[PDB]
Design a protein around this ligand. Structure first.
Ligand SMILES: [Cl-]
Ligand SMILES: [Cl-]
Length: 212
Protein backbone atom coordinates (compact mmCIF):
# COMPACT_ATOMS: atom_id res chain seq x y z
CA UNK A 1 0.00 0.00 0.00
CA UNK A 2 2.91 2.40 -0.60
CA UNK A 3 4.23 3.90 2.65
CA UNK A 4 0.93 3.14 4.46
CA UNK A 5 1.10 0.31 6.99
CA UNK A 6 -1.51 -2.47 7.08
CA UNK A 7 -2.57 -5.35 9.34
CA UNK A 8 0.01 -7.87 10.60
CA UNK A 9 -1.13 -11.47 10.83
CA UNK A 10 0.02 -13.82 13.54
CA UNK A 11 -1.37 -17.36 13.44
CA UNK A 12 -4.59 -16.17 11.83
CA UNK A 13 -5.01 -13.18 14.18
CA UNK A 14 -4.93 -9.73 12.59
CA UNK A 15 -3.07 -7.04 14.49
CA UNK A 16 -3.51 -3.39 13.61
CA UNK A 17 -0.19 -1.69 12.94
CA UNK A 18 -1.09 1.16 15.24
CA UNK A 19 -3.53 1.57 18.13
CA UNK A 20 -4.61 5.05 19.28
CA UNK A 21 -6.39 4.90 22.64
CA UNK A 22 -4.73 10.38 23.53
CA UNK A 23 -1.80 9.34 21.32
CA UNK A 24 -1.00 6.58 18.82
CA UNK A 25 1.02 3.43 19.60
CA UNK A 26 2.85 1.37 17.01
CA UNK A 27 3.07 -2.39 16.78
CA UNK A 28 6.66 -3.30 17.69
CA UNK A 29 6.18 -7.00 17.38
CA UNK A 30 3.76 -9.88 17.75
CA UNK A 31 4.14 -13.58 18.47
CA UNK A 32 2.53 -16.52 20.22
CA UNK A 33 2.60 -18.07 23.65
CA UNK A 34 2.33 -21.83 23.98
CA UNK A 35 1.63 -23.89 27.04
CA UNK A 36 2.69 -27.47 27.79
CA UNK A 37 0.04 -30.04 28.78
CA UNK A 38 1.66 -33.34 29.75
CA UNK A 39 4.10 -33.94 26.85
CA UNK A 40 2.18 -31.75 24.41
CA UNK A 41 2.76 -28.07 23.55
CA UNK A 42 -0.17 -26.00 22.23
CA UNK A 43 -0.45 -22.36 21.13
CA UNK A 44 -2.96 -20.53 23.30
CA UNK A 45 -2.47 -16.81 22.68
CA UNK A 46 -1.21 -14.30 20.20
CA UNK A 47 0.48 -11.26 21.76
CA UNK A 48 1.14 -7.87 20.16
CA UNK A 49 3.37 -5.29 21.80
CA UNK A 50 2.72 -1.58 21.11
CA UNK A 51 4.50 1.59 22.18
CA UNK A 52 4.87 5.26 21.19
CA UNK A 53 7.38 4.99 18.32
CA UNK A 54 9.34 8.24 18.35
CA UNK A 55 9.39 8.32 22.12
CA UNK A 56 10.56 4.74 22.57
CA UNK A 57 13.20 5.22 19.84
CA UNK A 58 14.65 8.17 21.75
CA UNK A 59 15.03 5.96 24.86
CA UNK A 60 16.79 3.12 23.05
CA UNK A 61 19.36 5.10 21.02
CA UNK A 62 22.20 3.15 22.57
CA UNK A 63 20.87 0.04 20.78
CA UNK A 64 20.99 1.66 17.34
CA UNK A 65 22.93 -0.18 14.64
CA UNK A 66 22.22 -3.67 16.02
CA UNK A 67 20.36 -6.27 13.99
CA UNK A 68 17.35 -8.14 15.39
CA UNK A 69 19.56 -11.21 15.81
CA UNK A 70 22.06 -9.30 17.94
CA UNK A 71 19.30 -7.65 19.98
CA UNK A 72 17.61 -10.96 20.71
CA UNK A 73 20.69 -12.14 22.61
CA UNK A 74 21.13 -8.96 24.71
CA UNK A 75 18.84 -9.48 27.70
CA UNK A 76 19.72 -5.90 28.73
CA UNK A 77 17.91 -4.71 25.61
CA UNK A 78 14.52 -6.13 26.63
CA UNK A 79 15.06 -4.83 30.15
CA UNK A 80 15.55 -1.29 28.78
CA UNK A 81 12.37 -1.73 26.74
CA UNK A 82 10.32 -2.68 29.79
CA UNK A 83 11.67 0.12 31.98
CA UNK A 84 11.48 2.91 29.37
CA UNK A 85 9.06 5.62 30.65
CA UNK A 86 6.77 5.41 27.68
CA UNK A 87 3.18 4.35 27.20
CA UNK A 88 2.87 0.66 26.23
CA UNK A 89 0.15 -1.80 25.38
CA UNK A 90 0.12 -5.57 25.22
CA UNK A 91 -2.74 -6.94 23.24
CA UNK A 92 -3.52 -10.59 23.88
CA UNK A 93 -5.87 -12.63 21.70
CA UNK A 94 -6.98 -16.17 22.58
CA UNK A 95 -6.24 -18.86 20.00
CA UNK A 96 -7.97 -21.47 22.10
CA UNK A 97 -10.65 -21.20 24.75
CA UNK A 98 -9.40 -20.33 28.24
CA UNK A 99 -11.17 -19.71 31.52
CA UNK A 100 -9.93 -16.69 33.39
CA UNK A 101 -8.38 -18.95 36.05
CA UNK A 102 -6.55 -20.93 33.34
CA UNK A 103 -5.31 -17.68 31.85
CA UNK A 104 -4.23 -15.93 35.02
CA UNK A 105 -2.81 -19.04 36.72
CA UNK A 106 0.08 -19.44 34.31
CA UNK A 107 0.56 -15.74 33.46
CA UNK A 108 0.52 -15.00 37.19
CA UNK A 109 3.08 -17.69 37.93
CA UNK A 110 5.29 -16.36 35.08
CA UNK A 111 5.08 -12.90 36.64
CA UNK A 112 5.77 -14.19 40.14
CA UNK A 113 8.72 -16.22 38.89
CA UNK A 114 10.16 -13.12 37.17
CA UNK A 115 9.75 -11.02 40.36
CA UNK A 116 11.31 -13.64 42.58
CA UNK A 117 14.36 -13.86 40.31
CA UNK A 118 14.82 -10.11 40.67
CA UNK A 119 14.40 -10.17 44.46
CA UNK A 120 11.23 -8.09 43.97
CA UNK A 121 8.49 -10.41 45.28
CA UNK A 122 7.42 -8.77 48.53
CA UNK A 123 4.04 -8.18 50.16
CA UNK A 124 3.10 -5.41 47.67
CA UNK A 125 3.70 -7.54 44.60
CA UNK A 126 1.99 -10.51 46.22
CA UNK A 127 -1.14 -8.34 46.78
CA UNK A 128 -0.95 -7.14 43.15
CA UNK A 129 -0.84 -10.78 42.02
CA UNK A 130 -3.85 -11.55 44.20
CA UNK A 131 -5.71 -8.58 42.68
CA UNK A 132 -4.75 -9.85 39.22
CA UNK A 133 -6.10 -13.35 39.78
CA UNK A 134 -9.20 -11.90 41.48
CA UNK A 135 -10.01 -9.94 38.36
CA UNK A 136 -9.71 -12.93 36.06
CA UNK A 137 -11.36 -15.44 38.37
CA UNK A 138 -14.90 -15.49 36.94
CA UNK A 139 -14.12 -14.47 33.37
CA UNK A 140 -14.04 -16.71 30.30
CA UNK A 141 -12.18 -16.21 27.05
CA UNK A 142 -13.34 -17.94 23.89
CA UNK A 143 -11.11 -17.83 20.79
CA UNK A 144 -10.89 -14.32 19.40
CA UNK A 145 -11.49 -12.64 22.73
CA UNK A 146 -8.84 -10.02 23.52
CA UNK A 147 -7.20 -8.71 26.65
CA UNK A 148 -5.57 -5.29 26.68
CA UNK A 149 -2.78 -4.62 29.19
CA UNK A 150 -2.18 -0.89 29.02
CA UNK A 151 0.70 0.72 30.83
CA UNK A 152 -0.31 4.39 30.67
CA UNK A 153 2.64 5.05 32.96
CA UNK A 154 5.23 2.58 34.35
CA UNK A 155 3.40 2.88 37.68
CA UNK A 156 0.03 1.43 36.61
CA UNK A 157 -1.42 -1.52 34.70
CA UNK A 158 -4.89 -0.95 33.16
CA UNK A 159 -6.71 -4.10 32.10
CA UNK A 160 -9.72 -4.31 29.84
CA UNK A 161 -11.02 -6.78 27.32
CA UNK A 162 -13.39 -7.44 24.45
CA UNK A 163 -15.04 -10.49 22.84
CA UNK A 164 -13.49 -9.46 19.53
CA UNK A 165 -10.33 -7.45 18.85
CA UNK A 166 -12.08 -4.10 19.29
CA UNK A 167 -10.91 -1.49 21.78
CA UNK A 168 -12.72 -1.00 25.10
CA UNK A 169 -13.62 2.59 26.11
CA UNK A 170 -12.00 2.35 29.53
CA UNK A 171 -10.03 0.22 31.94
CA UNK A 172 -12.05 -2.47 33.77
CA UNK A 173 -9.42 -3.07 36.48
CA UNK A 174 -6.24 -1.23 37.33
CA UNK A 175 -3.26 -2.61 39.32
CA UNK A 176 -1.12 0.10 40.86
CA UNK A 177 2.22 -1.61 41.46
CA UNK A 178 5.09 -0.73 39.25
CA UNK A 179 7.12 -3.89 39.82
CA UNK A 180 4.18 -6.17 39.07
CA UNK A 181 3.29 -4.21 35.92
CA UNK A 182 6.87 -4.34 34.68
CA UNK A 183 7.25 -8.05 35.30
CA UNK A 184 3.89 -8.83 33.65
CA UNK A 185 4.81 -6.77 30.57
CA UNK A 186 8.16 -8.57 30.67
CA UNK A 187 6.36 -11.86 30.35
CA UNK A 188 4.22 -10.42 27.46
CA UNK A 189 7.42 -9.38 25.63
CA UNK A 190 8.30 -13.03 26.04
CA UNK A 191 11.26 -12.75 28.44
CA UNK A 192 12.61 -15.78 30.35
CA UNK A 193 11.42 -18.23 27.72
CA UNK A 194 7.71 -17.26 27.82
CA UNK A 195 7.56 -16.29 24.11
CA UNK A 196 10.75 -16.47 21.98
CA UNK A 197 8.57 -15.63 18.97
CA UNK A 198 7.27 -12.33 20.48
CA UNK A 199 10.78 -11.44 21.63
CA UNK A 200 12.20 -11.96 18.16
CA UNK A 201 9.42 -10.01 16.53
CA UNK A 202 9.82 -7.05 18.93
CA UNK A 203 13.59 -7.05 18.30
CA UNK A 204 12.85 -6.84 14.53
CA UNK A 205 10.34 -4.00 14.90
CA UNK A 206 12.61 -2.02 17.16
CA UNK A 207 15.66 -2.65 14.95
CA UNK A 208 13.59 -1.25 12.07
CA UNK A 209 12.36 1.68 14.17
CA UNK A 210 15.89 2.66 15.27
CA UNK A 211 17.03 2.63 11.62
CA UNK A 212 14.17 4.84 10.50
CL1 LIG B 1 -1.49 -25.56 18.70
CL1 LIG C 1 -0.66 -14.28 27.17
Amino acid sequence: HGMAVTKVTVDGIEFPPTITPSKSLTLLGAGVRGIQIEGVEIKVTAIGIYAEPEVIASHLQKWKGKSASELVEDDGFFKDLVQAPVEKLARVTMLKPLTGAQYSGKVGENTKDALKALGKYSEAEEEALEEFREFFKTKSFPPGSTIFFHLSSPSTLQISFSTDGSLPEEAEATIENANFAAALLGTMLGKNGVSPSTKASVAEGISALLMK
